[PDB]
Design a protein around this ligand. Sequence first.
Ligand SMILES: *[C@@H]1O[C@H](CO[C@@H]2O[C@@H](C)[C@@H](O)[C@@H](O)[C@@H]2O)[C@@H](O[C@@H]2O[C@H](CO)[C@@H](O[C@@H]3O[C@H](CO[C@H]4O[C@H](CO)[C@@H](O)[C@H](O)[C@@H]4O[C@@H]4O[C@H](CO)[C@@H](O)[C@H](O)[C@H]4NC(C)=O)[C@@H](O)[C@H](O[C@H]4O[C@H](CO)[C@@H](O)[C@H](O)[C@@H]4O[C@@H]4O[C@H](CO)[C@@H](O)[C@H](O)[C@H]4NC(C)=O)[C@@H]3O)[C@H](O)[C@H]2NC(C)=O)[C@H](O)[C@H]1NC(C)=O
Ligand SMILES: *[C@@H]1O[C@H](CO[C@@H]2O[C@@H](C)[C@@H](O)[C@@H](O)[C@@H]2O)[C@@H](O[C@@H]2O[C@H](CO)[C@@H](O[C@@H]3O[C@H](CO[C@H]4O[C@H](CO)[C@@H](O)[C@H](O)[C@@H]4O[C@@H]4O[C@H](CO)[C@@H](O)[C@H](O)[C@H]4NC(C)=O)[C@@H](O)[C@H](O[C@H]4O[C@H](CO)[C@@H](O)[C@H](O)[C@@H]4O[C@@H]4O[C@H](CO)[C@@H](O)[C@H](O)[C@H]4NC(C)=O)[C@@H]3O)[C@H](O)[C@H]2NC(C)=O)[C@H](O)[C@H]1NC(C)=O
Lengths: 208, 208
Amino acid sequence: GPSVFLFPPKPKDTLMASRTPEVTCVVVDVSHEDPEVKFNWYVDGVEVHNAKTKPREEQYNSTYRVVSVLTVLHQDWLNGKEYKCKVSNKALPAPIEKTISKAKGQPREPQVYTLPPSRDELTKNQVSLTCLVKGFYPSDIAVEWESNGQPENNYKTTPPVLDSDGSFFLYSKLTVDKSRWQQGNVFSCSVMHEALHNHYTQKSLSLS
Amino acid sequence: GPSVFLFPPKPKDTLMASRTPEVTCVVVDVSHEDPEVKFNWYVDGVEVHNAKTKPREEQYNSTYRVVSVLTVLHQDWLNGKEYKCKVSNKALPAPIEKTISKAKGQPREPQVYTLPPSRDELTKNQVSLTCLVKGFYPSDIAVEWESNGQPENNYKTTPPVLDSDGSFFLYSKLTVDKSRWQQGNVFSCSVMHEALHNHYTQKSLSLS
Ligand SMILES: *[C@@H]1O[C@H](CO[C@@H]2O[C@@H](C)[C@@H](O)[C@@H](O)[C@@H]2O)[C@@H](O[C@@H]2O[C@H](CO)[C@@H](O[C@@H]3O[C@H](CO[C@H]4O[C@H](CO)[C@@H](O)[C@H](O)[C@@H]4O[C@@H]4O[C@H](CO)[C@@H](O)[C@H](O)[C@H]4NC(C)=O)[C@@H](O)[C@H](O[C@H]4O[C@H](CO)[C@@H](O)[C@H](O)[C@@H]4O[C@@H]4O[C@H](CO)[C@@H](O)[C@H](O)[C@H]4NC(C)=O)[C@@H]3O)[C@H](O)[C@H]2NC(C)=O)[C@H](O)[C@H]1NC(C)=O
Ligand SMILES: *[C@@H]1O[C@H](CO[C@@H]2O[C@@H](C)[C@@H](O)[C@@H](O)[C@@H]2O)[C@@H](O[C@@H]2O[C@H](CO)[C@@H](O[C@@H]3O[C@H](CO[C@H]4O[C@H](CO)[C@@H](O)[C@H](O)[C@@H]4O[C@@H]4O[C@H](CO)[C@@H](O)[C@H](O)[C@H]4NC(C)=O)[C@@H](O)[C@H](O[C@H]4O[C@H](CO)[C@@H](O)[C@H](O)[C@@H]4O[C@@H]4O[C@H](CO)[C@@H](O)[C@H](O)[C@H]4NC(C)=O)[C@@H]3O)[C@H](O)[C@H]2NC(C)=O)[C@H](O)[C@H]1NC(C)=O
């Protein structure tokens, strides 16, 4: 019958002042026969009620997808609180309890390195600027590129990868026109991770 | 009832001489009531019979997982042949036909760049060597590191990422002891992709 999924808040929401992080409970596969759903949000076993149950949009396979949203505390998430969402629907012989929390296991500070474009790329219209971030745990992270205190459009970041030591790494590639690089502009890789000081660090990258 | 999945061959198998690439049909969720499964392998509609149906290992949720394996031609896969695997089981009102093939869409040759370690890492026991591969389509690829004609252990590669242009990129990080790099050894990033000459290319990386 019904299958339930459960989602962590975004890394940036748990790390930066005054954002509103959110655990999300998504129930999928309820028919027209038993579509009346109901949630119960518990924070470390203790029941709480500041939840947001979105009304039930239909589907493209004739089921219903109900989404409840539970605002959490940035610090409640960082201190390892469990968030179990209890689901009710007659199509189930018994309610579904799915629980979620931050990755357990020793945290490790990311190491942030910048890499200038390989001398071979320097004959294309655009060039690639590279951020290596490595050594971090848990894998929850946010990486961003800017320049002169303003963000960047044309960058892409790889998912976190398990490294040989059991920590994570990733790369961010920032693509800019060759000229902007030749001209000597300054670009920054901003990283957000819990094991950083103030959850934030920044390494620059420019010509030499 | 039964849900069926379908898997492409490994990128290296379709690109290098004399390997044996394989499409794999994995049926999941069959009970003890209707566990008698049956396959039918078609190559571009035309039925074929050089298939390998593994006998049905049980599970940890009391279902059966049946796996048939179909050897394909390296060139039949590169020329866009469709491989539909037809599945039969009484728990289904009708057989399940899942079809699979190489990514359609114009292929693009990867551009392979090597990046030496950031001058900041040069105070750790080990250093990171970096291979950027970019501009390729379809995302099916194989990247490997070696040194003096022999492979490397301690390297990790990111999944292919969709770039802003609709092509893919990735990075491969090779971790070596600092000394091995200081000493001036030569390391190579080998790339395999269909849009390369002979499906293979290699860029080196050493000290200056
Ligand atoms: C009827 O249709 C619906 C709708 O889906 C689609 O809708 C139509 C329009 C088409 O597009 C169709 O393609 C399709 O029908 C179907 O509902 C789907 O049901 C499947 C389950 O079979 C669910 O798959 C799961 O996906 C989650 C992750 O999903 C996130 O990312 C998806 C994209 O990759 C995205 O589609 C989802 O919306 C969701 O997106 C996130 O949403 C939140 C919202 O708050 C957001 O904050 C996030 O940022 C956002 N992320 C983004 C943007 O992508 C995945 O985790 C599940 O994988 C686990 O479970 C699988 C078992 O089903 C198992 O195979 C995997 O290996 C994996 O295993 C898990 O492993 C972890 C540890 O790593 C463990 O903790 C877990 O317990 C374990 N799971 C197990 C085994 O229990 C899973 O693959 C889809 O979410 C869902 N689609 C949507 C959009 O809701 C439905 O199937 C159709 N009916 C039928 C035919 O049956
Ligand atoms: C009973 O148990 C079985 C076995 O699970 C095991 O035991 C249970 C108890 C749990 O503890 C599990 O955690 C444990 O693993 C369960 O069977 C599972 O069923 C789910 C579906 O609900 C399947 O999930 C799918 O996973 C595929 C890819 O799976 C590969 O990689 C997995 C790890 O990443 C690995 O677990 C799989 O074995 C498989 O491994 C591959 O194997 C081949 C063999 O040749 C090998 O070559 C590969 O190298 C290897 N790969 C890796 C990485 O190791 C995933 O693609 C599926 O996602 C699609 O479907 C989802 C719906 O569930 C949906 O959410 C996704 O969006 C996605 O939808 C697809 O989207 C694509 C485009 O992106 C589109 O083209 C497709 O059409 C569309 N799919 C369709 C058809 O709609 C999916 O998540 C697991 O394969 C399967 N587990 C195993 C081990 O087979 C079962 O759930 C249990 N019973 C129940 C119901 O409770």
